[PDB]
Structure formats: C-alpha cells, structure tokens
Amino acid sequence: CQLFCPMIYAPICATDGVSQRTFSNPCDLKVYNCWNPDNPYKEVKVGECDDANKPV
C-alpha cells in the first residue's frame, strides 16, 4: 500500500474478475484493497470500462 493522494478529479476502472467499479481517483482505490482483503480491486486503466474489456 502506497498512500499519496493528489487533488484532481480522475475516474479509474478496476476489475477483480467480477463487474468492475469506478473510483474518483487512483489513490482512493488503493486504500480500498489495502484494509479490505475480502473485496480487492485490480487496476485496468483510468476511465470507464465494461465487462467486455481486456484485463490490464
């Protein structure tokens, strides 16, 4: 876990095999997986992605 959050509005898409979710910023995402072991997310790209996309 690396916690360094900049003040910018950038949506990011991350998929953990299941239908993906979009966060307000990459730093807001990393914190979620860090202390939440049962519900982790894997970063694909910074955007809005669907379930028909390729894993990055």
TrEMBL record:
Designated name of the protein: Lysozyme-Protease Inhibitor Protein
Domain Kazal-like positions: 7-51
Disulphide-bonded residues: 13-49
Organism listed in the record: Coptotermes formosanus (Formosan subterranean termite)
InterPro entries reported for this sequence: Kazal_dom, Kazal_dom_sf
Gene3D superfamilies: 3.30.60.30
Any Pfam family matching the protein: Kazal_2
